[PDB]
Motif scaffolding. Structure first.
Motif, PDB file in Angstrom:
ATOM      1  N   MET A 181      26.889  33.688  48.366  1.00 20.27           N
ATOM      2  CA  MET A 181      28.126  34.055  47.679  1.00 20.27           C
ATOM      3  C   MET A 181      28.016  33.829  46.174  1.00 20.27           C
ATOM      4  O   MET A 181      28.436  34.683  45.385  1.00 20.27           O
ATOM      5  N   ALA A 182      27.419  32.712  45.753  1.00 19.64           N
ATOM      6  CA  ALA A 182      27.274  32.460  44.321  1.00 19.64           C
ATOM      7  C   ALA A 182      26.373  33.498  43.655  1.00 19.64           C
ATOM      8  O   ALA A 182      26.803  34.205  42.737  1.00 19.64           O
ATOM      9  N   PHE A 183      25.123  33.620  44.116  1.00 20.76           N
ATOM     10  CA  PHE A 183      24.191  34.541  43.456  1.00 20.76           C
ATOM     11  C   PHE A 183      24.430  36.010  43.781  1.00 20.76           C
ATOM     12  O   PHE A 183      23.684  36.857  43.281  1.00 20.76           O
ATOM     13  N   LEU A 184      25.428  36.345  44.594  1.00 19.73           N
ATOM     14  CA  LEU A 184      25.867  37.730  44.671  1.00 19.73           C
ATOM     15  C   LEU A 184      27.123  37.983  43.854  1.00 19.73           C
ATOM     16  O   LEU A 184      27.342  39.116  43.411  1.00 19.73           O
ATOM     17  N   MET A 185      27.940  36.954  43.641  1.00 22.05           N
ATOM     18  CA  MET A 185      29.153  37.093  42.852  1.00 22.05           C
ATOM     19  C   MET A 185      28.880  37.142  41.356  1.00 22.05           C
ATOM     20  O   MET A 185      29.633  37.802  40.631  1.00 22.05           O
ATOM     21  N   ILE A 186      27.828  36.479  40.879  1.00 18.96           N
ATOM     22  CA  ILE A 186      27.624  36.301  39.441  1.00 18.96           C
ATOM     23  C   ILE A 186      27.562  37.635  38.700  1.00 18.96           C
ATOM     24  O   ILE A 186      28.315  37.806  37.730  1.00 18.96           O
ATOM     25  N   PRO A 187      26.711  38.613  39.080  1.00 22.87           N
ATOM     26  CA  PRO A 187      26.675  39.835  38.271  1.00 22.87           C
ATOM     27  C   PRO A 187      27.961  40.632  38.399  1.00 22.87           C
ATOM     28  O   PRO A 187      28.660  40.863  37.408  1.00 22.87           O
ATOM     29  N   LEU A 188      28.331  40.977  39.633  1.00 22.81           N
ATOM     30  CA  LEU A 188      29.325  42.023  39.827  1.00 22.81           C
ATOM     31  C   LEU A 188      30.720  41.507  39.489  1.00 22.81           C
ATOM     32  O   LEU A 188      31.396  42.056  38.618  1.00 22.81           O
ATOM     33  N   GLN A 189      31.164  40.439  40.162  1.00 20.20           N
ATOM     34  CA  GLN A 189      32.508  39.914  39.917  1.00 20.20           C
ATOM     35  C   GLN A 189      32.727  39.571  38.451  1.00 20.20           C
ATOM     36  O   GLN A 189      33.599  40.151  37.792  1.00 20.20           O
ATOM     37  N   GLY A 190      31.966  38.612  37.933  1.00 21.64           N
ATOM     38  CA  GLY A 190      32.169  38.164  36.572  1.00 21.64           C
ATOM     39  C   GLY A 190      32.011  39.288  35.576  1.00 21.64           C
ATOM     40  O   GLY A 190      32.851  39.476  34.690  1.00 21.64           O
ATOM     41  N   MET A 191      30.935  40.056  35.741  1.00 17.59           N
ATOM     42  CA  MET A 191      30.585  41.096  34.785  1.00 17.59           C
ATOM     43  C   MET A 191      31.664  42.178  34.757  1.00 17.59           C
ATOM     44  O   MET A 191      32.114  42.612  33.685  1.00 17.59           O
TER      45      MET A 191
ATOM     46  N   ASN B 237      31.266  32.204  27.592  1.00 21.74           N
ATOM     47  CA  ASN B 237      32.075  31.179  28.230  1.00 21.74           C
ATOM     48  C   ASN B 237      32.003  31.208  29.750  1.00 21.74           C
ATOM     49  O   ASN B 237      32.412  30.232  30.386  1.00 21.74           O
ATOM     50  N   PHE B 238      31.497  32.290  30.349  1.00 20.08           N
ATOM     51  CA  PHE B 238      31.259  32.242  31.791  1.00 20.08           C
ATOM     52  C   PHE B 238      29.786  32.315  32.189  1.00 20.08           C
ATOM     53  O   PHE B 238      29.422  31.772  33.241  1.00 20.08           O
ATOM     54  N   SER B 239      28.922  32.977  31.409  1.00 17.39           N
ATOM     55  CA  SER B 239      27.536  33.129  31.852  1.00 17.39           C
ATOM     56  C   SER B 239      26.875  31.771  32.080  1.00 17.39           C
ATOM     57  O   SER B 239      26.291  31.514  33.139  1.00 17.39           O
TER      58      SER B 239
ATOM     59  N   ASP C 221      34.839  41.794  35.721  1.00 22.24           N
ATOM     60  CA  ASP C 221      36.130  41.317  35.240  1.00 22.24           C
ATOM     61  C   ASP C 221      36.139  41.182  33.722  1.00 22.24           C
ATOM     62  O   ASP C 221      37.157  41.489  33.085  1.00 22.24           O
ATOM     63  N   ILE C 222      35.018  40.782  33.115  1.00 24.37           N
ATOM     64  CA  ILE C 222      34.998  40.755  31.655  1.00 24.37           C
ATOM     65  C   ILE C 222      35.047  42.173  31.105  1.00 24.37           C
ATOM     66  O   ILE C 222      35.691  42.431  30.081  1.00 24.37           O
ATOM     67  N   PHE C 223      34.401  43.127  31.785  1.00 26.21           N
ATOM     68  CA  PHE C 223      34.527  44.508  31.331  1.00 26.21           C
ATOM     69  C   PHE C 223      35.969  45.005  31.382  1.00 26.21           C
ATOM     70  O   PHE C 223      36.433  45.649  30.429  1.00 26.21           O
ATOM     71  N   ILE C 224      36.688  44.737  32.477  1.00 26.51           N
ATOM     72  CA  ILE C 224      38.033  45.290  32.594  1.00 26.51           C
ATOM     73  C   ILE C 224      38.975  44.597  31.623  1.00 26.51           C
ATOM     74  O   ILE C 224      39.871  45.233  31.059  1.00 26.51           O
ATOM     75  N   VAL C 225      38.805  43.290  31.404  1.00 25.29           N
ATOM     76  CA  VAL C 225      39.659  42.648  30.409  1.00 25.29           C
ATOM     77  C   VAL C 225      39.340  43.191  29.021  1.00 25.29           C
ATOM     78  O   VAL C 225      40.240  43.381  28.196  1.00 25.29           O
ATOM     79  N   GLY C 226      38.063  43.485  28.752  1.00 27.62           N
ATOM     80  CA  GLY C 226      37.714  44.077  27.471  1.00 27.62           C
ATOM     81  C   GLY C 226      38.380  45.420  27.247  1.00 27.62           C
ATOM     82  O   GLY C 226      38.954  45.670  26.181  1.00 27.62           O
TER      83      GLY C 226
END
Lengths: 37, 295, 99, 440, 45, 99, 26, 50, 12
Positions: free
Chosen positions: C8-18, C49-51, C20-25
């Motif tokens: 869950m961690a190493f599958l969530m890192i690229p897609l989820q975080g990446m 701040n998240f990477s 969500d920062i794109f959509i907030v941008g």
């Protein structure tokens, strides 16, 4: 205002340590009951 | 050493309550805050020294103020101030900073840049205490286990003669080991060697563990002195967070099937002690050994 | 459960975080009148701040496996993660370092 | 110079995101309360059996002075002795101008020096929580005068507004986390009491009642499991879980459930509600500041050969010309709870730091392994059971089913599944199938 | 429409090229400081 | 049979997939009329697709090569593989975003 | 909402009291 | 190398009684399975490793 | 101040 909300919080605090005051009274009764029984 | 009841020729005539533990009749104590409250972590400022609240029947009187070790470090430093003082003898600006000019004149121009920084440290001059290092007491070594390396069923070099006089009994040196670091007269957990580098995040040794020389040394070096606090608590804590727990990977005790065999009148259940020595006492003990080192 | 939480961690890192920062941008830049340079600066701060918080939580869990006998899984995954791993992590860092 | 509230369901993301551990703190204190009441009841029972045999060793005969002491001494209340306001105000200096302590620790349970059980302190875990350092900074506080929040134009830690605070209001502002954890404690006390009362092994009464209807050996009545809005077992969070229920044919029969799955989230949203005023006063123009204009005067006194260094200042101006609160950094994540510590001293001969516990038990572990089976199951529901739950936002969480749903840890895992009456605010992995991972 | 995480690759690519885009739209946007005065000397001189 | 499967999965990456996608590219270009630009785009996307999917299958399998006393050595295998392995995955990554 | 759910739990409750009294009757 | 050094344990004697024999299963057990197998191999290891 | 209590233990 801000102060009045803080006073309401300390009122909740006061009722809480009154609850604790009831609590510390609520064991010596049971201890003396263990001895009496 | 005189405090240890183990070295007392006379045995205890009263209850063990008047004693503190099996290695100390009177505890030495631990550091305390400026408010007199129990010090646990060096990050909180602990100045005074006091008796541990733990009472196995009585609270024994402490002996040391905790300033003996650092007091020794202080008088050591004070009696080094002479030698380094007479070695110290302004010094940042000196007369021979000019001598290269004549040689540069003799050389010419095809090497001018070789004087560049020299020129710089001249141009600055027109436009503009210490403590010891390398004393080598770090190279020193102490080992307690060397009291027990010889012994065995039959013991060998290089100090087998301790065996020969001791008739291959080593207990009289095992209380020495428990005096150094509290094994096993006060458990096999023990206290690690306290590193002497600047560690703002250090845990004070609590409970009867503080009544060993290793724990005493550990607790004795955080007590701040009014002279000069030279250690700054970390500003990066709770930023690089590390929650590593040493409890998921721990072997716990098991109760085994006590399978009784009878040798013609003798009832004893060999399955259970095979279980309780093979696993609960060898495998578990070594596992928790590596586990404590890892911890 | 280690295998579980790991992937869950190493599958969530690229897609989820990446994502969500794109959509907030895009949400911040699409607003009328908002200064864009400071906006890209803030999304750089979210990148950096998240990477690395995700990075040191991988610190945590990768170290926190340590299981005897098999613990090499944390090696297996990691090493044949490291290229594409870095592929996103460096990617994230570079964005912030530019903007 | 002249011109160029909080959604109940959205707080589940706020429970844990690798930067907040309020849910972890709640789990720690809940398990701690299980520890206090359970350990209390076991010592009480053991002591009753000891004095009922006050003609035979160890309470009789020739006891060791330690066993004599245990036989004589009564057993106090650990829940009563534990509070966090008093420990906090013991830790912080009474002076209101000095720098406040950065963090606060609270070993659970809590005994004072005269209490002969000081070594038991910390047997039931430890909680940690930091100070609100936003007000720890120098804010011109006075012992008896009036304090003003930093506004705009000075080195400020709070928002861009100024408010007047007296001594009483400010010290009560210090106790925000104090009565926070206190209300956690009071609200989980009832849940802990119910849970410890639900276990037959803790029923010291020799009950000969219906032993064939108990849900398990550790609970006559199951707590229950999350249930989807339609009314079936919400095994996975992916399907929405709304209600609470039982499971039929759990052990040949179904028993009543005592909870809604909303007590845990209930504690959390009371926590958030009482914190709302405090952070609200900390945050108290915000979109404009006068400091952004002051740099021009020095720029005049300064020259043009440094113009570039004001570049991002200029963007700060021309851009302005064209132009749900949750607590963060609480510190409850730093707490710890080890369940194995009650059985730590036991072995061939019992060891520190709780040897004397084992000496009262005469080196039996049964009463304490009963506590462990209460907390996480082992071994009354198998040699291996449920583990410490991940309280961070995990949209792939799996609710535990069957008898293991009737342990503390599994109950916590199931409770952090359900959805509060508010609209859902937790985003699952957008593509979980796209990274499949097939191992068995 | 892009199947799998192929579009997701596109996703990363876009913002990378974005920032690089932004970078060059930055870098060529402030050459003028030392890029105009030479041709000022050119036209007047 | 695990190492049989690992050799199988570490053998088909260049040959099977890469040859097949180049063949399908050949047939889609050889007909007069198909837009070549969209064509190279198309095999670029299927090409990154095959690369990533195979990469994730190796993820799965090299994780599941956790046999005691011997999965260390599948890990030595992926170690001595990762340069030439990196070579092929480099071909697909680079040509993927190029085309 | 909360009221609705505990009413439903109470409704489901009123079916097993008969069977436990039945077992006591066995 | 001494940080890992593994000491010599004194196990409780596993007193077993045959009709007129008596001796320690447990003690010789620990002495030979552990005190002179595991200690021996690991000591040979540290001795070469130093 | 310990002197008093080892004294005591002795005459006890």
């Amino acid at each position: 205002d801000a102060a009045s909300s803080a006073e309401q919080l300390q009122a909740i605090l006061q009722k809480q340590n009154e609850q604790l005051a009831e609590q510390k009274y609520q064991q010596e009764i049971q201890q003396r009951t263990s001895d009496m029984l | 050493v005189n405090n240890d009841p183990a070295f007392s020729t006379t045995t205890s005539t009263g209850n063990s309550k008047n004693d503190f533990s099996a290695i100390a009749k009177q505890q030495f104590g631990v550091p305390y805050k400026s408010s007199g409250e129990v010090c646990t972590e060096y990050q909180q400022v602990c100045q005074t020294w006091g008796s541990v609240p733990s009472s196995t029947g009585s609270t024994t009187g402490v002996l040391f103020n905790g300033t003996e070790f650092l007091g020794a470090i202080n008088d050591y430093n004070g009696i080094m101030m002479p030698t380094l003082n007479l070695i110290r003898q302004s010094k940042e600006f000196d007369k021979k900073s000019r001598d290269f000019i004549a040689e540069a004149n003799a050389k010419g121009w095809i090497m001018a840049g070789s004087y560049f920084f020299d020129l710089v440290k001249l141009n600055g001059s027109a436009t503009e205490d210490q403590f010891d290092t390398g004393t080598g007491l770090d190279k020193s070594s102490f080992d307690p286990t060397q009291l027990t390396k010889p012994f065995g069923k039959t013991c060998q070099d290089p100090y087998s003669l301790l065996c020969t006089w001791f008739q291959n009994k080593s207990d009289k040196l095992i209380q020495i080991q428990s005096l150094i670091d509290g094994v096993p007269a006060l458990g096999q957990d023990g206290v690690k060697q306290p590193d002497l580098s600047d560690n703002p995040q250090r845990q004070s040794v609590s409970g009867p563990l503080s009544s060993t020389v290793y724990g005493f040394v550990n607790n004795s070096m955080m007590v701040q002195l009014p002279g000069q606090p030279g250690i700054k608590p970390l500003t990066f804590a709770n930023l690089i967070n590390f929650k590593v727990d040493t409890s998921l990977y721990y072997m716990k005790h098991q109760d085994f099937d006590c399978g009784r065999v009878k040798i013609l009148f003798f009832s004893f259940c060999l399955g259970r002690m095979m279980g309780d020595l093979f696993y609960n006492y060898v495998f578990r003990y070594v596992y928790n050994f590596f586990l404590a080192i890892f911890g | 459960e280690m295998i579980n939480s790991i992937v869950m961690a190493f599958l969530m890192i690229p897609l989820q975080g990446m994502k969500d920062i794109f959509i907030v941008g895009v949400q911040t830049l699409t607003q009328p009148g908002i200064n864009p340079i400071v906006a890209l600066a803030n999304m750089g701060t979210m990148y950096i701040n998240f990477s690395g918080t995700l990075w040191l939580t991988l610190l945590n869990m990768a170290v926190s496996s340590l299981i005897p006998l098999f613990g090499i899984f944390i090696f297996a995954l990691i090493m044949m993660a490291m290229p594409l791993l870095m592929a996103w992590i460096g990617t994230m860092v570079s964005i912030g370092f530019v903007t | 110079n002249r011109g160029g509230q909080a959604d109940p369901t959205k707080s589940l993301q706020a429970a844990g995101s690798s930067s907040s551990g309020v849910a972890k703190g709640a789990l720690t204190i809940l398990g701690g309360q299980i520890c206090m009441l359970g350990l209390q009841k076991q010592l009480q029972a053991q002591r009753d059996l000891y004095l009922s045999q006050s003609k035979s060793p160890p309470c009789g005969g020739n006891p060791t002075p330690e066993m004599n002491t245990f036989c004589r001494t009564a057993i106090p209340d650990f829940i009563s002795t534990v509070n966090f306001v008093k420990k906090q105000n013991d830790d912080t200096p009474k002076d209101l101008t000095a720098n406040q302590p950065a963090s606060f620790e609270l070993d659970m349970p809590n005994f004072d020096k005269s209490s002969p059980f000081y070594f038991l302190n910390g047997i039931c875990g430890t909680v940690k929580w930091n100070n609100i350092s936003a007000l720890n900074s120098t804010n011109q506080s006075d012992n008896k005068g009036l304090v003003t929040v930093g506004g705009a134009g000075s080195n400020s830690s709070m928002g861009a507004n100024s408010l007047n605070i007296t001594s009483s209001q400010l010290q009560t502002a210090r106790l925000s986390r104090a009565i926070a954890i206190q209300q956690m404690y009071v609200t989980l006390s009832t849940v802990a009491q119910v849970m410890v009362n639900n276990d037959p092994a803790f029923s010291t009464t020799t009950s000969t009642g219906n032993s064939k209807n108990d849900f398990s050996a550790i609970a006559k009545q199951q707590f229950g499991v999350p249930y989807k809005s339609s009314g079936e077992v919400c095994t996975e969070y992916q399907q929405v879980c709304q209600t609470w229920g039982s499971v039929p044919s759990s052990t040949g029969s179904t028993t009543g459930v005592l909870f809604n799955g909303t007590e845990f989230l209930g504690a959390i949203n009371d926590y958030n509600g009482i914190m709302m005023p405090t952070l609200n006063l900390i945050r108290q123009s915000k979109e404009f500041d006068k400091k952004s204009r002051d740099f021009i005067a020095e720029a005049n006194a300064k020259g043009w050969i440094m113009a570039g260094s004001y570049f991002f200042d200029l963007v700060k101006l021309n851009g302005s010309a064209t132009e749900d609160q949750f607590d963060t950094g609480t510190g409850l994540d730093k707490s710890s709870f080890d369940p194995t510590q009650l059985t730590k001293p036991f072995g061939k001969t019992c060891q520190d730091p709780y040897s004397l516990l084992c000496t009262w038990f005469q080196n039996k572990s049964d009463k304490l392994i009963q506590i462990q089976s209460l907390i996480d199951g082992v071994p009354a529901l198998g040699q291996d059971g449920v583990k410490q739950p991940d309280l961070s936002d995990n949209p792939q969480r799996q609710s535990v089913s069957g008898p293991l749903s009737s342990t503390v840890y599994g109950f916590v895992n199931n409770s952090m599944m359900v959805q509060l009456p508010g609209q859902p605010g937790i985003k699952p992995l957008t593509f979980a199938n796209l990274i499949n991972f097939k191992v068995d | 429409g892009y199947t799998g995480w192929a579009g997701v690759y596109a996703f990363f690519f876009s913002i990378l090229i974005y920032t690089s885009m932004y970078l060059i739209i930055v870098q060529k946007a402030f050459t003028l400081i030392a890029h105009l005065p030479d041709k000022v000397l050119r036209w007047i001189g």
